Design an enzyme around this catalytic site. Structure first.
Site, PDB file in Angstrom:
ATOM      1  N   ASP A  16     -10.812 -25.343 -37.094  1.00 52.39           N
ATOM      2  CA  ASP A  16     -10.158 -24.439 -36.156  1.00 52.39           C
ATOM      3  C   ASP A  16     -10.670 -24.615 -34.722  1.00 52.39           C
ATOM      4  O   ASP A  16     -10.330 -23.839 -33.826  1.00 52.39           O
ATOM      5  CB  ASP A  16     -10.381 -23.019 -36.685  1.00 52.39           C
ATOM      6  N   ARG A  30     -10.343 -23.072 -29.394  1.00 54.84           N
ATOM      7  CA  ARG A  30     -10.212 -22.388 -30.663  1.00 54.84           C
ATOM      8  C   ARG A  30      -8.727 -22.296 -30.976  1.00 54.84           C
ATOM      9  O   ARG A  30      -7.961 -21.883 -30.107  1.00 54.84           O
ATOM     10  CB  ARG A  30     -10.837 -20.999 -30.583  1.00 54.84           C
ATOM     11  N   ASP A  35      -7.232 -18.683 -39.263  1.00 57.04           N
ATOM     12  CA  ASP A  35      -8.600 -18.803 -39.725  1.00 57.04           C
ATOM     13  C   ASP A  35      -8.728 -19.850 -40.826  1.00 57.04           C
ATOM     14  O   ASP A  35      -8.111 -19.629 -41.871  1.00 57.04           O
ATOM     15  CB  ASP A  35      -9.141 -17.484 -40.302  1.00 57.04           C
ATOM     16  N   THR A  36      -9.509 -20.879 -40.563  1.00 54.87           N
ATOM     17  CA  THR A  36      -9.789 -21.923 -41.533  1.00 54.87           C
ATOM     18  C   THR A  36     -11.140 -21.654 -42.196  1.00 54.87           C
ATOM     19  O   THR A  36     -12.004 -21.087 -41.531  1.00 54.87           O
ATOM     20  CB  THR A  36      -9.860 -23.344 -40.954  1.00 54.87           C
ATOM     21  N   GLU A  38     -14.737 -22.686 -42.961  1.00 54.47           N
ATOM     22  CA  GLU A  38     -15.498 -23.480 -41.991  1.00 54.47           C
ATOM     23  C   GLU A  38     -16.575 -24.326 -42.651  1.00 54.47           C
ATOM     24  O   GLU A  38     -16.952 -24.057 -43.785  1.00 54.47           O
ATOM     25  CB  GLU A  38     -16.084 -22.528 -40.943  1.00 54.47           C
ATOM     26  N   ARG A  82     -14.471 -20.304 -25.167  1.00 59.28           N
ATOM     27  CA  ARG A  82     -13.499 -21.262 -25.723  1.00 59.28           C
ATOM     28  C   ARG A  82     -12.076 -20.971 -25.289  1.00 59.28           C
ATOM     29  O   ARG A  82     -11.639 -19.817 -25.214  1.00 59.28           O
ATOM     30  CB  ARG A  82     -13.587 -21.200 -27.246  1.00 59.28           C
TER      31      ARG A  82
END
EC number: 3.1.31.1
Length: 136
Positions: A16, A30, A35-36, A38, A82
């Protein structure tokens, strides 16, 4: 209307997060709305489907001829500095491709950074129906 801008890959960092050259400067981006799992999550470390989400984003931005960034209508950076954006690889939105493959969930949304929300939720419902990866 949102507008895409050209950018150059520097390094994929995770499912992500990508480092990109934007308007001459190196910036960490970002991916908005997703939402991945991680590989370098704050607490747990390397979650399941993490390596896979991460390889998917990397391949996709590394193999692109053209990368573009599309900011949403609200804030464009988060508290860590980010960039917050939709990323496109040859016209294909990376954020949606991850969700469509069951390699990401649609994040908790924050108005007004929510333009492609419905679009993403539609792909997420399809990946769950197909029982893909995270949904398997």
């Amino acid at each position: 209307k949102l507008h895409k801008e050209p950018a150059t890959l520097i390094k994929a960092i995770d499912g992500d997060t990508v480092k990109i050259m934007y308007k001459g400067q190196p910036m960490t981006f970002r991916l908005l709305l997703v939402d991945t799992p991680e590989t370098k999550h704050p607490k747990k470390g390397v979650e399941k489907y993490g390596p896979e989400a991460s390889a998917f984003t990397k391949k996709m931005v590394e193999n692109a001829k053209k990368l573009e960034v599309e900011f949403d209508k609200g804030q464009r950076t988060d508290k860590y500095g980010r960039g917050l954006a939709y990323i496109y690889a040859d016209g294909k939105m990376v954020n949606e491709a991850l969700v469509r493959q069951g390699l990401a969930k649609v994040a908790y949304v924050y108005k007004p950074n929510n333009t492609h929300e419905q679009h993403l939720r539609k792909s997420e419902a399809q990946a769950k129906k197909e029982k893909l990866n995270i949904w398997s």
